[PDB]
Write a protein that binds this DNA or RNA. Sequence first.
DNA 1: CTTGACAAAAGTGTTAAATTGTGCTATACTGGGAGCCGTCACGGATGC
DNA 2: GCATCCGTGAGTCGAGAAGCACAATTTAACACTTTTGTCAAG
Lengths: 222, 14, 94, 104, 1113, 80, 39, 263
Amino acid sequence: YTGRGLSFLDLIQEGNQGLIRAVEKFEYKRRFKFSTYATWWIRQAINRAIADQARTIRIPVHMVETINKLSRTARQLQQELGREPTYEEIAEAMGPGWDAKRVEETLKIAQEPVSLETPIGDEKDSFYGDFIPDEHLPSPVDAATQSLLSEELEKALSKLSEREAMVLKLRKGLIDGREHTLEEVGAFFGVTRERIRQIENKALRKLKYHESRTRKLRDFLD
Amino acid sequence: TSDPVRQYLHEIGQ
Amino acid sequence: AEPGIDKLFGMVDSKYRLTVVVAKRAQQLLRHGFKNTVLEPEERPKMQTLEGLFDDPNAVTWAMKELLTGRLVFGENLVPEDRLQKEMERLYPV
Amino acid sequence: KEVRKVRIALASPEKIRSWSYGEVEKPETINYRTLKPERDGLFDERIFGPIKDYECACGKYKRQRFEGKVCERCGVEVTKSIVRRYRMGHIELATPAAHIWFVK
Amino acid sequence: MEIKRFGRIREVIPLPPLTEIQVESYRRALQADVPPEKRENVGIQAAFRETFPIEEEGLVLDFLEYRLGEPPFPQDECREKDLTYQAPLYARLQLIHKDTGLIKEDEVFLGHIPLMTEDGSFIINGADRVIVSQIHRSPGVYFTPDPARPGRYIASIIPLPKRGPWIDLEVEPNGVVSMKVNKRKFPLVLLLRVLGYDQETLARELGAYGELVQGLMDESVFAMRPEEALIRLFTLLRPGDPPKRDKAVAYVYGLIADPRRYDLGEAGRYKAEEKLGIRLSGRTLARFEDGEFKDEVFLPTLRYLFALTAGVPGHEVDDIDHLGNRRIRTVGELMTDQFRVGLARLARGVRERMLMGSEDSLTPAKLVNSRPLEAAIREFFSRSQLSQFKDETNPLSSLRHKRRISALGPGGLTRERAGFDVRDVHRTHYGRICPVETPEGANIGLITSLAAYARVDELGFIRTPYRRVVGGVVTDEVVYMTATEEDRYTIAQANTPLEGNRIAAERVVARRKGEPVIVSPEEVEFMDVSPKQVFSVNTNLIPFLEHDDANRALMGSNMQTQAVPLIRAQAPVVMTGLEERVVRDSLAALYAEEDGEVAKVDGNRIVVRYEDGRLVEYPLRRFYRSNQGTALDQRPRVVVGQRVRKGDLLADGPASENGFLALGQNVLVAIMPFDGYNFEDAIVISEELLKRDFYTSIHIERYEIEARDTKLGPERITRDIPHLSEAALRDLDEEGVVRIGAEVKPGDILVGRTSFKGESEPTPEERLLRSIFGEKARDVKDTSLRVPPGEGGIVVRTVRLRRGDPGVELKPGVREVVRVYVAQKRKLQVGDKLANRHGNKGVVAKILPVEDMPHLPDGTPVDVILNPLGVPSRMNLGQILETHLGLAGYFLGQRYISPIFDGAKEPEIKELLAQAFEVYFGKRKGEGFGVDKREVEVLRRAEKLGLVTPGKTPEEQLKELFLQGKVVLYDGRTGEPIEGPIVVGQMFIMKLYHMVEDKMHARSTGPYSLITQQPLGGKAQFGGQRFGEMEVWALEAYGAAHTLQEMLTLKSDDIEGRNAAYEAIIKGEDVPEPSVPESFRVLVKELQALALDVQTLDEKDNPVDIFEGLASK
Amino acid sequence: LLMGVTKSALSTKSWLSAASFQNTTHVLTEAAIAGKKDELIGLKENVILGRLIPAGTGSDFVRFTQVVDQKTLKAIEEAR
Amino acid sequence: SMARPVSIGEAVGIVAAQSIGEPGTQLTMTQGLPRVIEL
Amino acid sequence: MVQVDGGRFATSDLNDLYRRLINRNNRLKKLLAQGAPEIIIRNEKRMLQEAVDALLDNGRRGAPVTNPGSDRPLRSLTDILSGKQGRFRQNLLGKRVDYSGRSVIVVGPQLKLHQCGLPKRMALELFKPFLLKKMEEKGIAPNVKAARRMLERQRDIKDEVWDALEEVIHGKVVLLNRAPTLHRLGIQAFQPVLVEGQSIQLHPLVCEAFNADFDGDQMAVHVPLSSFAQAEARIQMLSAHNLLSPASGEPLAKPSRDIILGL
DNA sequence: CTTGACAAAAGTGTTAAATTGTGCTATACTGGGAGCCGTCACGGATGC
DNA sequence: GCATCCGTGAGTCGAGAAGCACAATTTAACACTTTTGTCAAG
Ligand SMILES: [Mg+2]
Ligand SMILES: [Zn+2]
């Protein structure tokens, strides 16, 4: 079973676990020699270990069987067609419930990850990791626009009344908290869950008036 | 000694 | 070469002390918007633009020219940093 | 304050456990279908922190209001995802293993 | 422009096929044309017959024959669709049951074998590739002196690479001969006994020498029987394993006697017989026949070592670097080696599978699994160090790449185990390897080129031709001889005077074992074919090579391979004679197959009606993009109704003019300083060159995009890109791809694509902004393809591939792929690099108007100005001589052919200059013009420098200057003459492929790395510049503490610092103070992963937290 | 005692500078056992931490210089 | 570099290394650069 | 363990080394709970010991561990911090920087000893953050976001941007570097002069210090940002201020090939 | 400031397809398999 | 003392092959219920 993901010593240890189980179930009454029965368990453990420990991204045992069966079928067709079979041929040979789409999906599931230290070039001076950008942390440009927008929006809300600005900040989550429902805001100010809507909608209109008359807040809309 | 596989095989042969 | 560099080098005991004074003066000029300059109106550096002459926007150029005049005082333990900034704020609000 | 010196010394097993936010018990990295980190694996969120800012794995908390909180359904703390670069785990060896640096 | 020929040497043979090294080797390996029963045991045929038959040990799998099918697709289709040009391989296998005695035969599909094109290159995954030949030590038996102990010699046995271990035989100081195998030393007597050798047999053979034999006699071993010694030897070789006869014989048999593990090879076997004077039965050290081991080479090797140590006159040591001891592995040998390796793995499966599972019901197709073989072949052609991306900047670029010899590669010297010995020019390189051409730098001497007349023989030894000299008269019998065979003769020189066929010179310059000598005609036995056989093809294109320093001719030959094809390229005025052959053998042009008449001529195809009556149509490759981006197209050179003889030219290929290799332009050159624009190799050129489209080239660029399937949804290539104005989408067609013929500048959209947005809630401020304007966030975002900065051109082509297309094997999850080709016509500009064939290179630094350039008295301005200060230090005087001949040909309207080391000389050149002056000055007198006043002033100054003879008339003094190649040159700015005569002439200058347009790069912010968070690198990724240690040391030495600190934190990896610095700058403030870099934090965490407690302290030793409490529990 | 440049460099008192030069495994292991503390005296140690090197404008001799004009100095003087 | 007394705070250590090692390529690889390295 | 592009994951070797250690540690726990013989247990512990060694330093003891279907050794913790490609010499002692460019160099004889020729298109990218503020100050753009969008497309750049760019770089300097930097005069500060083209113009007198000729060499451009960085460059690193050689004290910027010939 | 109405949108809940983890086969099988190879030189250290 | 072994270094930029059963666990659907958010009415 060598050359399938697991080293030689790892296979032996997995086999030893199967051998221990055989001693527990082996019935000497039946007059069968030990190697006859113990071989089943040893092979089962060396085959289960491969399915559970041969991949960086683990796949269920049932899926591993499907992938191996797909490889068998797609190799019988190769030497039978004298060329690489297309997804339609593989799907038809597999049987019912298999189509061209499923064959492709199963093959995109069986793609191993590629190491970040694989050299590219004659020398050992460049690697894959040198060419993969970091797209998680905001860039300096994106950080600046976020701060600029908050500064411009803050001044715009300064033209409104004190309560309306608080209503919009609370209702819109400018206080770092999720948008508080009208009610929740109504309990904050002890007013109806309809009054908050009326003032909030009114104030939202006035902000609309000012921006149209100044156009100092549209370039941020992307 | 330096070969784990060689060392194991010797142990089980005893 | 920077104008009057030979004169500047002879005003300090270490060429690195000149850089610190020049760099610190530039920060003072930028922070107060050039309102604390010790240069008279006919001495302020100018840059030639299409519209016309305008004040030079480079603060490091201003600091070097101010030092050559001799109206600046530099040294160690002159005044506490906290009180140095507070007086500069009051004299030249920004 | 400001850094003035840097010291290096051996780490005791007690200190190593003080660094860790939890023990890694399984070799699973991520789920082969949903692509999310697997529980108790090498990328577990309950150990090394949330993947995205102020958002637990179950998606019950989704705002900065609950900062420093630990969701009950999953166990993922509601904090910045940068902590995922600074937090460590540990593996509890069944038997002691010598450090090669001090042997070879 | 009639061509004048110089020279006296008459060559008896023409240049051999220049690419036969790449082509002949592959034909021999495949043997795809010979009938199966006529195939010999070479190439992949020997690989089949070696592994087969496979025996289970009563099942036998035998091999009968093989065949190759037609390629599935043509070459053109493979390039477009990213396929591999290959042919299927089938083998006829029959299963024989030794038990029953039954045979079952069927044909099994083994895989695909890549095919080689007509020019000698492969198409691997749609990209042209070349397999480079490798030079290594020839297998055999060698005798080198012992470095530690004088008077001692060591015998070494070397097998084929990776076909056995190296054996060493040495006489120990004790007197005991020791054999070293796999770094294990033991007495050779033990093995000698294993081969059934008695004490008397050794004494009778090795006893007729000094005391050496006595050290070879130990009574303990000899009393031991050969089988008894077999077990003890097994224990010595590999101790620990249980000593068994079955195991001991198997290990020993396969170590030195298994024809499937130890292969001396044809070259090794032939060398062994040549040296030891024996005939080896096979290619193995020992033979295991009839249940016993029989010696083959061990005893003969010991004899040679003994006699050499004793001091017999006839035995001598071997030189490892001698070209007779070094052989070349061509493409055919390299491929078959990988074929044998893959075949072996297939045999392992056939065995492990024939002893398991329904053994009775078995067929040859069932046992065989070819996937192992198909992988070994695919790996070699894709992931090998000798399989290199083809170089096709110009036709000469690709031709040289196929004639390159490399000592590196899998199974060869590294760049650390490579020392002066291997990089030197051995005396045997004469006529086999070019001494000048080599990559300057760290690979100098490790990569070389085959000579012009050399040809690699069957065994891999380079041979060179020599003319037989008999009775003092030169004959036409040309003999190809190897270095070892060449050492037995006196070889004269090609330039020896001949009065017909008899040597005329009484004293002949010859060579005896590489050392020059002076001999008489009666002592000469061979002669050189011509001076061309000593240099490579690239060095044979340099005229006046005998006047150039070797260090500078190396640059000139290398730079010829970097010239770009020009739309108005012209052949050089001064040629060497190889310009026609290079184009013919590069398969770039198109030639008539036989006598006929042209029926149709078009910019796309030529139809020729031959004598036999058949019509042949030749499509023309037009505006095709090469590997380097250059445009390669063929232009018809015939007209309808024109009669064409066999071999006539039908269409010019890239970089050729009427069948002549034309890599540059012929320009009028003045050698003089000019206002400092010539400083340190810079060049000054006239604006007139740009006006007439001189040095204008066409380059094509390809851009590719993909539409894939995603969990969120599929990417769709559409013209309806969100938040884009009609100005940006003006040139996109209905399908979202740019229309052909549109002009695209940087920032423009090539193909529009939209991708589903990842589910993510927007920030509270963004949500408020959307509410104000009443805009609902869309479910798609702009991810289209745009022109990168600094690029552009005219769209010329667009190729669209979709899943399910015939022959299109798209990777899983890829719906379609779109490719756009953009072509731009580049003119000469400041910063572009020019050069000539004599190693003079520089960048254009100024482009003067026509009225500023110096002009001749008749009003002709010069085209280029070269600084004379570059000549004296480099000692490349060939360019000066080329200019003198060019000036003569400029006024006479003719071209010249001067072969290297046999061609034009100053007496011949000065005679031409005399004729040119009559046209140059005779024309002036006829028009009614005398001598200019300015010309008289210069003549007065010139006579003071000793350039002209006093007392002569101005016309005669002017002629004296002209014969020296100098003319009176006026200044275009002032109109006064240059105070001294200047050297003017015509030079052939090539435009190199290194252009400033492709190299200028700048960046303020962009992508950052994953782990370190530092800026990426390279122009393609928009990366920054590397501030290495040496650059940090410069800032430390300057005392720039604050400038250094920024490059380390603010501008590289201080995530908080860099974000704040950018925001401050755009706000009109000064950048803030930097903080701890993110790279130091990574180092601390990695040290902690090693179980080391790294702690940063403060003035009082109190711990300081640099992680901002994010790592504190 | 006399020693070469390599040995004289590897036996320096700072582990941060010695570790970055050569024998990283040997240097780090020897320092960890002894619990060494790098005082950040040289230039390499400050470069690694991204601090201000103690040379040129970053030296203690000139790093604390103050510049002030005549008017403000008098105001501070009298404001005493 | 200035023909005057050295200013306090200069990195004379780095200048010594660069000055000595810069002309190294000009020293023909008990003679030449090999001699300097052993010294 | 990232998802490159939108296909295939990329992972470091440390994940493989950790997985091997966890797999063997977990297996040892199972074997101990089952009361396996000493031969089995002894083998498991030895394997667990070898798993740790490879994680900490692969290759020091025994044959290096390699990934399946490959002979490339896995990268351990020790190899990360050691060697020319390690953390110390690759990311701590030297880094890649922003606000940096590169291009071919040509000779400019009309320049002063303290000037250099910087292409306009390089200056536009190097000084982008400064340029955006200047555009906003004038009427060129309404805000920084609008200004940045203008510079994205080459055909959207008006002619006033080049006038604003001329104001931004007034007085400032840039550092020119040619590798290898064998002495301190391999990095010098010049006053840029915007020029039409794509090559950097270098003063003839500073070629000897750089050891640079004009056969196709290239140089890198770096932009000091703060006043302290600008003050140091304009005082200590300026080309016109470093005229004598620190090694010997003799002139280093002196007449050269063509200048000597004329005089 | 609310009033009763609508229309959801969000949350909860049970089911049932669907995926995933686990145990078991009884003729006799009883110690692996690939390397093979052009460096130069100090330190710096066991061993007899 | 010597040998013999064994680690540590060796320039810089850029561009480059088992199957099946059955139990345990999770995801998907359609149902209801309950907050929200809106709208004519002062
Ligand atoms: Mg150069
Ligand atoms: Zn949660």
